[model samples]
Each structure stands twice: as structure tokens, then as C-alpha cells.
Target: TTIQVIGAGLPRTGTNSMKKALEIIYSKPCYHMFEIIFKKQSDISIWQQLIDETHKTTSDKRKIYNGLNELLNGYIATTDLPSCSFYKELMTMYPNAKVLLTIRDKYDWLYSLRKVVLPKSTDPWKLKIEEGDQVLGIDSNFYKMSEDSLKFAFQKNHINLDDDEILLECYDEYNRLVQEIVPPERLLIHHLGDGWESLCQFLNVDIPNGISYPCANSHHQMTQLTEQLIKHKSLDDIIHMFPGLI
Candidate 1:
């Protein structure tokens, strides 16, 4: 069916954790970048075109939503990019869906971005995402798709990753924009530290016991994943190591 929850937060804002949390609450799968990277049916080129087409004339934007509805047909909730980049569009497509805006301290967010997302050119183990070349030969599609989305995101926001001033300003603006645009009744601006109480209440669902809220995609986790990925783990094996990754 269609997505019921829309995560408007940018990456590096505990989105993987949100994905896990949403899945727990809804008993349905949540869409994340990991899906694109690991799922056999995923095609990055379709998303590349969707992003490009969405930014085109208003008449052309319908194509973006149509493609997304088709591509993400079975997912009940979606987070991270390419979903995050198309928040407003998805909100329109699924008007009844609740919006979850995951945020963190600005400096912390920027620090995380620099640590995990900013390209590291010289490191062979941490290569820049090129068209078909794999990051360590196991996650090439993920890398290439990420690179495409990064280019689109940076361009749309009009800020370079290195430009702290503009980047932070854009980040603030994005949060402010979501706050202003989405009706309060349908929006929950969430901080990971706040845990699952508010989230469960927001969704009108009972919180589960014995399952601690997830805090995933930490810098340490990313580092460990990178190291293991370079060792050439199979997709299933990699997914097993990082359960939240899928």
C-alpha cells in the first residue's frame, strides 16, 4: 500500500533509529537507504531520475510521486534520503501520514555529517562513490546512489558540505520550513533522547516492553561497518552484522 509515516529529517539525525522505531510501532517495514543498497529489486537509476524529475516544472513533478508510489508500494513508513529530500511531495501524496522530524544539536549534527557523510578522497578503503565502482567492491550501488542524492541535496540546499555557515543555516531553514508547513496535528518534532513515549503517544500506539529504543548509525557503528565492508562481506552477511541496516 502507501506510506503512512513520513520522516522529514535529514540523514545523520538518528534516521536509522527512526526506521527501526517506526517498524516496531507499525509492525510494517520502514524504508531506508539500506533497502536500496541491499534489496535486489532496488534500482538507483530510477531514484536518480525521480530526484531530477521532481525538481523540474510543476507538471513534471507528478511523475516523481507516481514513480515513488510504484517503487515504494509496500512500505508503510519511509525515512532518510531519497525520501527525506522529497518530504513535501510525499506529504502531499500521503496526506493522512504523520510527519516525524528527527533533530539533534546543530553542532552535533554537523559533526556527524563531517565524520560519516563528507567524502574522503584519499582513503582507498573509504572511496568516493563513482558510477559502477564499489566502495570496497561490495556496496557500489549504495555508494553511487548516495553520491547522486548528495549532489542533488547539496545543490537544492545551495550549500557545500565544507561551508559551515551556509550548511547550518540551510539545516535550520529546513527544520523551520517543516515546522511552518506541516499542520501541528500531524507533526511530531522528535529528539532521539526523548525516547519512545512521545512517539508511541503520537501514533496512538501502546509502547512495547523489554525492547529498548534503538540508537543506531553511530560513528563507531559506521566505522565498524566500513571496516567489515572492506573485508568483502556478502550483502546478506553485512545485513546480519548490522541488523538495523536493512
Candidate 2:
């Protein structure tokens, strides 16, 4: 079996870029929100319920949340609580799998969440937009997935149900659970600032210095406005084609 990488990082946190980078650097399959979550919107609910039931064996029938280990070259779930549940079960299924928990400077993580996730959002805006929409909402796919998959031994087997609580509460619990389950060697806790050297050290792969990470389709759940401006190919038409920003 190839080394399976599950990016258990909550959404944002350079998730898209990291997924893109891994796809290029390792020549391995990498999956993130755009390819999976957006496609099977309802399956998000299904996976959550399954996890809430405390599922361990992942069958490949659904293709949404099924046979995850069997299909991909590796899996990188940028969604938060989903990553947490995967960490909980994976430690059992493939005891040798490399689990990477992504982090960013605390402020950046918080900033990105607030800017990209916490707000009421849609396609252009990835934030939590309505009731049962926020990251912690019971209806949110990621939360449901985590609730269903728990072994029940971890934290009494319920999603953090404190009403009127802050977002950081869930993040703290996630960080704690990961720390508890994954042994130090099998797990890697990473931050964007650490860059490629840190990743190489964690994965035991050769370091490729001087390579910049790839561009995600969007950044902070917002598209790349500036990059679009500079990369516009019409040299003579460019000066006349100053479209207002998105």
C-alpha cells in the first residue's frame, strides 16, 4: 500500500495550496474540497450520519465517503471535523499510515477562518452562511461526518454540543484529540510557515529547495484577483482592459 496522507487540517490554512503542492511534488493523488465536497453535496450528510454511528470499516460503494483508503493514491481532507474523525479511525485501520495535521500561525488560522469560513458564504464565499451552515452547525457536512464516525471512546462520542460557544472551542478539541490518538512518529503536525523543509523532514522525502507552492483555484475562499490581473495575456489590450475587481 502506498503511503496515504490525510490532511486533517480544518478547512482553509493553505489547504488548497497544500493539496496542489502534494499532487505535484509527490506525483501522488490528492483530494480537497473542490473535487469532493462540492460534487456530492448530499453525501456530506450521509457520511456524517455514518460516522455518528461509529463506522470503522469503509466500504467503497458510495464513492462519496466509501473505500477512501482503497481508492485514492492518498487522501487529503481539508475539511476540519472530518479530518478529526479520520484521524480517530485511521490510527486503527492502517496503523502505519502517515497522518498529517496541518496548522498555521494561530492568528493566520483564525483570520482565515473568520474571513473564509465563519461568514455566511456560498460559491465565491466559502464561509458558513446560514443556519446549520457554520463549521460547527449540526447540519454542516463536516460536523455530521465527525459525529457519525466516532469510536465513542473519544470524548464521549458526541460533537461538541455547547450552544452559543466560540469556534475556537472545536478547534481546541480537535487539536487535543489528534494529540491523544496519533503517536508522534506516525503523525506530523505542520504549519505553512515551516514550508518544504519541514514537510520533507516529516515525510522523510528529499527536500526540494527553491520551489514555491502551487496556486489554489481560490485563496481564502476568494478567487485570485491580483494574479488574474498580472497574468492577463493581451499585452496591447491589457492597458485598455481594466475590469473592476470581483
Candidate 3:
């Protein structure tokens, strides 16, 4: 099956949890940032190529459509970047798919983003955590993947994540654009704790018995996850900590 849900949401907005929840409902893999690190390392280069080549031109958009097909062949849903920023394009490619907007307080998101994703304050912003290379034993290529998609997702050439105003502005505009663009019937606005009821209703699925809604990827958890990744020099051991990835 093709991607059924396009998460038009920002990072740190329960996307990690949504990835798991969608997998539970669909009984298939869902795409996330971790997928590139954990499942298909090659996807990093494929995505970089897509980022450089994709544009609004017909041929470019077509390339994006065709490119994601192979990159995300086995996934039934997508959450987080670089797919989060491409929800509009994904909607065009998968017309029958649902659009999901996972949201939380804007400032809360900012806090989490700074803690995990944009731990650096470079003028352009980056995801380099502590050690320069071999972060969590993930090659430098993965970090470069994060940089390429960051600007593409922002649609900006110059960005400073250290500036709260600019960061919040991007956050609001991204959310507003998603809300205004997607039709109501095809959109599902999800918050962290809404859990199975709303999600199941939207997808027309029966909520599984005894399963609590996944609440994951907290700032502390992220910090610890990276620590574990570096400590273990591989993501395989802690892979189970993240849901829906395999």
C-alpha cells in the first residue's frame, strides 16, 4: 500500500509517537527521521539528491513523486522530516491519503526543538549534538541530510534557530499553511494525548484493546537516546525504544 497518512506537522510534536500509532493501525512500517539512520542508510543520499533537484516545476515535482516511491516503498505512512515538510507534495501524489497535523504549544515545541533537533546555534542551524563526527555512530552523512532538509522545509536560504522570533514565525506559518491548504474532510488535527479514539475514528479502524496511546520522544528521552546511541555506537540495541521502526 502507498503512504496513507502525510504528517503535516513540525518535529517534536509527538511525531515519534504518531509514527508508532499509525503503524499499529495500519499494521505496516511508517517513515520517520530515524528510518534513515536505522533502516536504510542509503536513503540519506537519495534524499539529498531529491532536495537539490526538487522544485515547483512540473518535472521537478514529478521527480519528487517518483523519488519517494522507491525511497519509501515499504512505508504505509510518514511523520517528521523530511517528509513532514513535503506533505503538500505527498497529498498531490497520494490523493486518497489523509493529512495529519500533530500539534502542541508553540513555545513548548520551540523548547523541545532546541533541546533535541537544533541543539546547535549556528547561523544556519544544525543537528550536531556533541561529538563532531560519528554521532551515535551515525555517519556524518546523516547530519548532512538533516541540514539539507532543514532549509528546504523552511523554504529559506538563511536561518538562525538561535533567534526565537524567526523560529516561532516559521513554526506558525508552517502550521497555518497546512491548516489553510488541506480540505477539512481529508485532514486530522491530532494532539499528543488524543490517543486512539480520534485517530481510529479518522481512519475507520478499531482501537486495539489494552494499548495506551504512545507518548514518546520527550526532550529527556531524546537526550538519553542520543547518549545511548553514542554509547552503543549503533542504533540497533535501542531500536526497540522507538516504535514502528523495522
Candidate 4:
């Protein structure tokens, strides 16, 4: 159950699609951010713990190595943040694994995060969700994933959601660092729209037959579905409508 593909990509870089592609190639579960949100909510605390453990001044990284091993034991690959921050460690842990660096236009990436996932102080829906979570003792804790990914995983440290310039700077720095660090042969630089051919060649897997490559890119409905969740206070009614997203 070793991870053969480690995503060094940031969120909103077609991660969901890459997750699906990896799942098909590896024929096993791949760890994406949604895995925590939907499939494994208990893992969120583990991520926070990893974030905490990683923030220490001490150089001991064994805790993260051991913790990630346990946390990701069964997954065949890792995609998106939380793991993206730990790619270097993971590469050391699984020397056989290939690094997948997903990238898109920097300004577009910033725009997407602002409109889609990044929690905004002005977004009444997120505020209401926060209010209701406290009342109901529910904690999705997705915002931490964003902030921590930017702050620590991406190593940006500055987390002003409104600061477009700095956020874009961090995004560039992160991508630049990934390219600088990962070995060229061991790293696959995947652009958002570059589908199966390159990925299959890199991974030495045959392309899936008949079916077109999965396109789980959701610029609008992803946020719209969150609105639906808040409006209905449940997902069952709206979940079926967005099957592709689900």
C-alpha cells in the first residue's frame, strides 16, 4: 500500500481530476482533500496535528514521517494539500514514488481560490456555517486546510485572504520551489488540461479504454453546492444533482 504517486500540487489545480486519474491508474484509493471532507472526517484532526508537529523549531521530522505512514497507509497515492506540503518527506519515505506537480496560471489560481474554497470574512454562508457548527458541535474545519496549506504547506506564512499580491507570490514560490527540489526524472509536471497521455507514460500505465479522461473541474457548482448545503441544511437533496462533482 505504498504511495506510487505523490502530488506536489496546490488545490484547484485539477486535483479532483488527478485523484480520479490516479485511482484508475493505480486501481486503489487516492488521498485527496475531499477524502477528509466526505470519506474520512476523522483525519482532519490528524492533519491539524501534523500541521502542529511540522511547525516546531526542532528538526526532528520522524513524527511526520511516522504519522503520515500511519495516516496514509492504505492509500495508493496522495493529491492536493496537507500531503502536498509533505512531498519532500514522502519522496524520502517512498523513493519509488513519482512526484506529480500540478500547475496553472498564477492569477487564475488565486482567482479560483478566492471565489471557490478560501474562506472569506465577507461570505455570509461560511459565517453561518461557523455559527451553526458551534451550536451543533459540528466542525468541518476545512478552513484550516486552506490557511495551513498557505501558511505552512506552501510556506507562505502570510494568510491575508484579501492580499492578492502576496497570495499569488506564495503560489509562485511554492511551484517554483517544487520544480527546483524534485528530481526531473522523478517529477511529472502536469498542467490542468494535459490529460491522460503524459500521465500514463510517466506512470507506465495503459490509458483507460472507451471512457474519456475524467474532468471533475468545478469552478461554479462546487461553491454553488455549498450554498445549497447551507440552504437545505443537508446534502441529500442536492447531492444527486451534481453527480459529476460527487
Candidate 5:
């Protein structure tokens, strides 16, 4: 069986791609944060049950137990558990797991969040503001929501400022922290710019050279102005018209 792999990087930097690629190479289902956290593999009433959970204890052990030889044949996990501090425990449990630290420039990451993720936000965002409410000019009730989001976005895998000068410092600190803790070989720093050869080498897998990375946001690629307008108009139209349905 193939050894287990643990992701230690902050999300972004193609963590999703790496997760999918590992699953393809090992022929097993990948178990990332998107699978359980947001999707809620377990019942919502028992959300706290996850704090003590493990791959072995979870009811759906198919992906965790028989990876590389059963089910999807491999698994990849990408969770952003704030303040839980469970990453080290994961490493201890999955001793043979290779740690993949995906990384990117701090400023670019913030822009990506502001551009790609922040617009989409989460269910909470939908609950807080109506569609047409200006994001930069949120209402008082929604002010807390915006603050919470800002805090989440600027945590561990983030930087303090948005300026180019601070950008360099942020990126360096991010890389330095990962390197200082994770050992060489077992930990790999990945970048979207690395392309296929680097990925193949990192995972020690060669499924061929023709596979293409999945385009995130999966849009036809709109200009910033167009994208913002779409988000603003669609969000307002959907929320105002639907009145809490979206």
C-alpha cells in the first residue's frame, strides 16, 4: 500500500489540485477539508464529534483505511481548522504520511481571496447581507460578519499588509515558518508555477505527462471589472428578489 500523505500548507497554492492528483495516482478517494468540514460527512448535531475523530474511527473508513489499493486508491485532506491546533496530532497518527506544503505569495493569496473566494464567501455571508449591499459598505449587523471574515483570511497563512513592500515580507515569513518546522524531503514546498514535472517529482508518481491541472473558479476567465459587476449584480438580484432563498 502507498504511504499516507498529510497536507501542512495553508490552502491555496494548488492544494486542491494536489489532493486530486494524489487520489488519481493512488487510485483512492482523497479526504480533504472540503469533503467533511463544509460538506458535513457527519451529522451537524454531532459536529463536536470531529474533535476526537481519526481516520480509523470515522464511520466511512473506506478512503482512510484502504488507500492506494481500495476505494479511490488514495486520499488527500485540506482542512483549515481555526484555533483547533490539531495538525501536529495528524502527523503523529499518520507517521508515514508525506507532508505537502503548498505555498504562494502572500499578496497574491490575499488578492485571490478577495477576487475568487471573498466574493463567493460562504453560507454565512449570504445570511448576513442582502444581494445589493455594498461589500465595502456593509450594514451594522453585517459588520461583525465582515470582521470575522477578515480575521479568517489573515491568520497563519497570511500577511499583515497589502502593499508590495509588505508583500515580500509576508511571502518570506510564510515559507520560512514551514521550512523551520517541517523536515526536508518529507515536506515539499509547491507552487502553481512549478508545473507538472515538479509535481510528478514531489509525489514520486508518473501517471504520464499529459494530465492537466483543473482550473479553479472554473470560469471562462473574466476580467476583474466584469467579475466584480457579476458578483455585485448577481448577489443583490438573487438575495433581494429571493429574500433569503439564495
Candidate 6:
């Protein structure tokens, strides 16, 4: 149940591809946002509780990490949200684990984020949760998760949520913080173009033959998938609709 790799990357930084690659190298299921969505056996309501606890005092932050440890049990590596938002905590919990910080062109990152994340964030299913309150409703899980994380990101940087420039500055700030905090020996600042060799070298694993590095999760496809998931009433129905994503 110990995690060997901690991905500190934000979304739209090729996290989906990293999830697939990590699964190949670790020979275990790597956790992602999809993992949360597809998980039928585990209870994720704790995630909301953790988010709440995270905004409290330092002592409550420990409680948040404890909840994360329980939720991430049996996963070898993790990427994408809910988890990515807690990278510093996870790195502290597993000091020996390697850190991977994914990066891409800032303009492209912003565009991709708007295309894939903004819609879900701004859609009617969300938008009603008041500041300083736990999001509650029958359809609140995903929206609550997204909003909480985004709000945290903004607050952490002391930036106004409405300012796009400041938002990108916050993104830059996060990347710089990772670079500043993580020791050089255990950190990899990865770009998608670096390919499998760099990744394999970092992990000290041989590149698998005939397995070209994956390039996927385009904005259109992600938007399509989100629409499909929204159409279904349950995770089981979503899986039934898109067998490949599962």
C-alpha cells in the first residue's frame, strides 16, 4: 500500500498518459481522477471531508493526510486531482518516494484547462456552493471536488479567482514551489516530449519493447467523455457506456 511515486503535476499536463505509464512500470493500478470515478468498493465521501479539514489549522492537516492514506490504500502511484492538490503532504508522508512534476507550454496548458476543466467547473450542476460551506447535494461530488481544489489553489497564492493572469502566475508559483522544495536527486521535471527513456531512467526501469509512449486525452475526447458520464446516472452506467476508459 506504500506509494513509490508522487506526481505533483496539475491537470492538463498529460496526467492521464502518466497514469497509464506508471501502471506499466509499477505493475499496479495507478490512481487518477478516473480511479475515483470508477472506484465502486471504496468510499470517497471522505475526500470532501479531507478538503474541509485541509483549510483548517495545522493539526487538521494531519487529519487530512491520514484520510488520504486510508483512501489511497493499495495504490502504487497517483496523479491528477484531489491527490495532486495534496502533493506536498504525500511527499512528506513518503520522503523516499520519487516526485514527478509534469509541465507543458503555459498557453497550451491554459487552453487545454479551459477546454476540459472550465466547462465542468462552470456548468449548472456546480456554481451554487457558497464560500466557507461544504458543498452538498445529490450531484455534488465531482463539482465539489473541483471547486474546492480550485478555490484552494487561488487562496494559497493570494490571488483573485477572476484574474486569468494571476491564475497563471499561481500556476507558475506552484511549479516553482515544487522545484524549491523537492530535493534534486528525487525530483523529475517532466515534459511530455521527453518520452519513455527519460522516465525509465528516472525509475531505473527498462523501457518496455514495442510500447510507445502514449499520447492521448485530447480536449475534445475529454469533453465527450464528460458529457457521456453526465448522461449516466451512476458510475456503473458510465463504465458500461465507455468500457475503454475504465
Q: What does each candidate score in C-alpha RMSD?
A: 3.1, 8.3, 3.1, 2.4, 9.7, 4.7
> What lDDT score is found at residue 66 in candidate 3?
89
Candidate number that wins on TM-score, 1 or 4: 4
Q: Per-residue lDDT for 89-172 in model 3, tens only?
A: 889988999999999889999888887777655622234354422644566677666766766777877787568888888888
Instruction: Report lDDT per candidate.
Output: 0.75, 0.51, 0.79, 0.79, 0.45, 0.73
Clashes of 3: 0
Q: Please, what are the lDDT tens digits per residue for candidate 6 over residues 41-76? A: 244577778777767756586787788888888989
Candidate 2 per-residue lDDT over residues 1-246, each given as its tens digit: 254566666666666666766765677656654444434455465555444444446533344334445433344333344444555555555566677777765555555555434432333343223221322222455533533443232345444432214445556676667767677887778776566777777777776667775544334224332233235533233434433111
TM per model? 0.85, 0.61, 0.87, 0.91, 0.54, 0.82
Which regions of candidate 2 deviate over 4 angstroms? 1-3, 38-46, 55-81, 120-165, 215-246
Of 2 and 6, the candidate ahead on TM-score is: 6
Sort the candidates on lDDT, descending order: 4, 3, 1, 6, 2, 5
Error of 6 at 238 (Å): 8.4
Supply candidate 6's per-residue lDDT for 57.
Answer: 59
Candidate with the greatest TM-score versus the true structure: 4
- Select the stronger candidate by lDDT from 2 and 6: 6
What digit string (tens of lDDT, one per residue) describes model 1 on residues 57-176?
564877887988877778999898777877888899998999999999988987777667654455343452231124434355555566556556545634445577766877888888
Candidate 6 clash pair list? none
The reply for model 3, stretches above 4 Å from the true place, is 55-59, 122-135, 231-246
Candidate 6: minimum summed lDDT over ten consecutive residues — where? 128-137
Worst 10 residues of 5 by lDDT: 43-52
Q: Output candidate 3 Cα RMSD.
A: 3.1
**Given candidate 4, what's the lDDT at residue 194?**
91
Candidate ranking under TM-score, highest first, comes to: 4, 3, 1, 6, 2, 5
> Candidate 4's residue-wise lDDT over 195-246, tens digit each?
9999999998788887677888576766666566667676666678678664
